[PDB]
Design a protein around this nucleic acid. Structure first.
Ligand SMILES: Nc1ncnc2c1ncn2[C@@H]1O[C@H](COP(=O)(O)OP(=O)(O)OP(=O)(O)O)[C@@H](O)[C@H]1O
Ligand SMILES: Nc1ncnc2c1ncn2[C@@H]1O[C@H](COP(=O)(O)OP(=O)(O)OP(=O)(O)O)[C@@H](O)[C@H]1O
Ligand SMILES: [Mg+2]
Ligand SMILES: [Mg+2]
Lengths: 510, 47, 114
RNA sequence: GCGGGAUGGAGCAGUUCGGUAGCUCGUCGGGCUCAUAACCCGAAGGUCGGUGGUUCAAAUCCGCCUCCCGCAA
RNA sequence: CUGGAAGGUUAAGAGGAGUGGUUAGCGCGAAGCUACGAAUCGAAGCCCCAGUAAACGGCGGCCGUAACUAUAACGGU
RNA sequence: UGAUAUUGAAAUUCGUGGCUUUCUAACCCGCACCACUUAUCGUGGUGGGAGACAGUGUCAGGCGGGCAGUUUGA
């Protein structure tokens, strides 16, 4: 028993999020904490760090407040120095700022500071945030190495299938502990959803049959009440006896309703859409021996790049290759070389950024979407709902929203920006398990061109049309069949199999 | 629209009981009122 | 470990199957056209019976069997290519047999298709 | 008089707690055929019965009205 | 009603990290005695799955269509 | 339907505790033979069968119009 959370209401700030929240965390146990976006998985982690007992680690998931602190003294925020030989992370260097790193190079300078902290319980956020397919196959081997207790937030159902020992599912009812991996949690959450709809389908069919018996007694009654003499005590008495028939099956109906009440409420299969402008030309953007450099780092030497009308491009590489800086050259970065990034003079662009430099902090939700040119208030508030902004989140500063929200807020600005191309940079990274499908259909039901930068394999596996790549300092293509030829010696090998005919088999008994 | 308790900030705790709308005042309310243990006007935070 | 098994080729008009045993019918390893993920009308053909007959042997090659004496069963388009897949992958056939079931007039057979 | 209705031409979801007008069939114009049906391609057609109210926002909620339906006048 | 390898949820009992009381000592708190008390373990049943009507029980609407009219063998939903 | 008492023995097994086996001395037989004995009761002896189960006490959970006591406005 490493830690008990005695039943108390959870709340980050003035607002209250949950009441009656309790759970325990053993020793030497890695415990996943999954839940919907905006429910409080990160506020609960702040609580145990600040207001709770035993010292902890608290690897955050934004690092935005501290963006000018020199790295190598952010790592030493707690305190000859065992860091050079701790480059298993492959962290670049410790002389930059910390708001100047890659998006996924600072999710392993905060994982470095968390492992070297020497505390009993490690409070970790997302940690597969922004990471590659190789740096994400490395810490799967790292979490299975330390005898400390971890309590992390993942919502990544490939990482969640090997690491955890139990799962803690926040609901706004409290935490419901499960055992096993994500697939053991998922099986039991399915059996639990059948019973509520079989139980709901069985109360509707029990209460409609009592309404129809009741309604039949009343057709008999008003037909009999006009035929009965008011001066007959026998015919009246049969009339009051018939009323008892329906008056007592109205009391059976009223004890089913005021006693048997549930709903199947999470049933709305709506979906989003965006409409392009039908470019009508061949090339969208182009590079002409472009080069770039970050004061010592030579990112791109002279390279070529092209995107034509109605294409889908998938850029690849690793952490630090230059994906999010190539997307910057397309809008504006003013190359140091000549380069001359050749762009069409009539382009609309829909930008989804890794860091939320699109969104204006210190700006309410309602008054940020309304910053566009000729947006009205009805069509703005009405599209703001259907993205799950429940008409009361209108007066919230963007600076104090969730991470899942405000990744959903720059999708509600894409709808009002009818583009020619969508430039999406890690679009399914901060989204929970249920919202990663509602925006994979959106990207596929867009009839324009898109440039996708993404690290999850099961999203960029069925949409692979064109795949560039950054190997040394230059982009490559998928029309480079220099890697693996098919080695056409089949000419020598599909000549033995040519002679087993369909009639040669008919003969030649064995 | 809730019920709120105004507790003294130095003389220690509850003196007054009021109401508030938590959509218009989501924070904790602040008002100077008479603490009768200090015999003096002080500041009262909502509990 | 083991030496001298027998290969049990089993080809039908959909799907061949090769299973290698010891000489006591002990099932060293099996494999077959549809396991490699061949869909119908490819599942059936002589190429796939020579994949399948060598994803087997090479995965019981590895028990040091090297001499097999095959027994064959079925009609099959892809029977015989599965015995140049075998003897290809280093196994040294001994001598073969066509053990197919033949009633000495037993039970009655299904209708025939129109 | 009481019950249930009205959502492109037909038949129907969606209303039950307001937030991007939907499904099958048919209609129209091309193709295929010696010709027709079937099949393939492309489009049209929506006051959510009428008329007012509530709301940042109404097919959804609130009154009034004319139709259709079933019992019973 | 019958039959289900497992998985979930559940009793008594087992277990005893912790929180209170008192006070030899020096507002802190050793033993002892005391008021309690969590994690884990723990069966039927129930959830869930298949079968059974000479078991209990149940056995539909609207629309268009034929060389008189009317009906509709035929069609849509 | 569980825990626990009556209630024991040896081993294998995986974690001093449990699981499962096997053994028999306890307990059980409306079971054969022999005495009491004129006896289809009972008690005692002897073989067999089963056996730490079952039956029995205490505590616990499910089911429970089979059966009770009642309520079912002005
Ligand atoms: N300073 C603040 N004042 C008031 N409310 C706040 C403040 N900061 C955050 N919140 C609120 O607290 C909630 C916390 O959501 P939280 O960020 O914990 O969700 P999450 O589990 O991180 O989801 P995701 O990881 O998908 O973003 C948000 O709804 C947000 O509105
Ligand atoms: N302002 C800057 N000054 C100096 N160097 C920078 C600056 N911004 C980025 N870099 C360097 O450029 C490299 C690539 O940054 P970039 O934003 O392309 O990362 P990325 O490829 O988007 O990473 P990820 O794919 O994980 O998001 C990094 O190694 C970083 O050190
Ligand atoms: Mg968060
Ligand atoms: Mg980046």
């Amino acid at each position: 028993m490493l830690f008990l959370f005695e039943e108390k209401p959870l709340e980050i700030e003035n607002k209250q999020l949950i009441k009656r929240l309790s759970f325990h965390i053993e020793d030497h146990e890695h415990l996943a904490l999954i839940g919907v976006n905006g429910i409080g998985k990160s506020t609960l982690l702040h609580h145990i760090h600040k207001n709770e007992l035993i010292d902890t680690a608290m690897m955050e998931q934004d690092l935005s407040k501290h963006d000018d602190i020199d790295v190598m003294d952010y790592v030493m925020s707690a305190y000859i120095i065992i860091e050079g030989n701790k480059l298993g992370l492959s962290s670049t260097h410790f002389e930059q700022k910390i708001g100047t790193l890659s998006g996924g190079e600072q999710t392993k300078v905060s994982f470095l500071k968390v492992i070297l902290s020497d505390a009993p319980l490690l409070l970790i956020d997302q940690p597969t945030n922004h990471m590659d397919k190789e740096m994400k196959v490395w810490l799967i081997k790292a979490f299975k190495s330390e005898q400390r207790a971890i309590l992390f937030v993942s919502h990544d159902r490939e990482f969640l299938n090997e690491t955890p020992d139990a799962i803690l599912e926040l609901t706004k009812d409290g935490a419901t502990r499960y055992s096993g991996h994500y697939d053991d949690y998922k099986n039991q959450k399915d059996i639990e959803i059948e019973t509520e709809k079989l139980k709901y389908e069985k109360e509707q069919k029990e209460q409609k049959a009592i309404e129809e018996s009741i309604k039949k007694y009343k057709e008999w009654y008003q037909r009999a009440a006009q035929k009965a003499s008011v001066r007959s005590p026998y015919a009246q008495k049969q009339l009051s006896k018939l009323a008892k028939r329906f008056k007592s099956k109205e009391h059976q109906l009223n004890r089913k309703l005021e006693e048997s009440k549930s709903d199947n409420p999470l049933e709305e299969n709506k979906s989003f859409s965006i409409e392009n402008n039908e470019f009508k030309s061949h090339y969208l953007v182009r590079f002409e021996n472009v080069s770039f450099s970050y004061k010592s780092r030579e990112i791109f030497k002279d390279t070529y790049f092209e995107i034509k009308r109605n294409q889908t491009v998938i850029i690849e590489g690793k952490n630090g290759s230059g994906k999010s800086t190539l997307i910057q050259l397309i809008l504006g970065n003013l190359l140091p070389m000549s380069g001359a990034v050749k762009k069409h003079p009539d382009l609309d662009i829909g930008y989804f950024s890794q860091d939320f430099q699109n969104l204006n902090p210190n700006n309410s939700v309602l008054e940020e979407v309304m910053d566009i040119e000729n947006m009205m208030i009805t069509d703005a508030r009405t599209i703001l709902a259907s993205f799950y902004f429940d008409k009361s989140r209108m007066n919230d500063k963007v600076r104090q929203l969730s991470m899942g929200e405000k990744c959903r807020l720059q999708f509600v600005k894409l709808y009002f920006s009818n583009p020619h191309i969508l430039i999406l940079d890690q679009p399914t990274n901060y989204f929970d398990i249920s919202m990663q499908e509602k925006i994979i259909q959106l990207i596929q039901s867009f009839n324009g061109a898109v440039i996708i930068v993404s690290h999850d394999e099961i999203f960029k596996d069925e949409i692979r049309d064109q795949v560039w790549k950054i190997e040394n300092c230059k982009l490559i293509h998928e029309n480079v069949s220099i890697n693996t030829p098919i080695d056409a010696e089949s000419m020598k090998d599909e000549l033995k199999i040519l002679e087993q005919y369909t009639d040669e088999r008919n003969k030649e008994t064995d | 629209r809730v019920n709120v308790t105004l507790a003294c900030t130095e003389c220690g705790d509850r003196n007054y009981i009021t109401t508030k709308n938590k959509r218009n005042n989501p924070e904790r309310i602040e008002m100077k009122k008479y603490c009768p243990r200090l015999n003096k006007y002080t500041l009262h935070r909502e509990t | 470990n083991i030496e001298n098994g027998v290969a049990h080729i089993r080809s039908t008009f959909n799907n061949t199957i090769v299973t290698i045993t010891d000489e006591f019918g002990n099932a060293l390893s099996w494999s077959s056209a549809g396991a490699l993920g061949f869909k119908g009308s490819k599942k059936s053909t002589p190429f796939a019976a020579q994949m399948a007959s060598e994803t087997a042997s090479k995965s019981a090659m590895e028990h040091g069997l090297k001499t097999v004496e095959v027994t064959v069963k079925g009609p099959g388009p892809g029977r015989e290519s599965a015995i140049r897949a075998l003897q290809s992958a280093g196994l040294e056939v001994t001598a073969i047999r066509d053990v197919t079931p033949v009633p000495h007039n037993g039970c009655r057979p299904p209708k025939r298709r129109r």
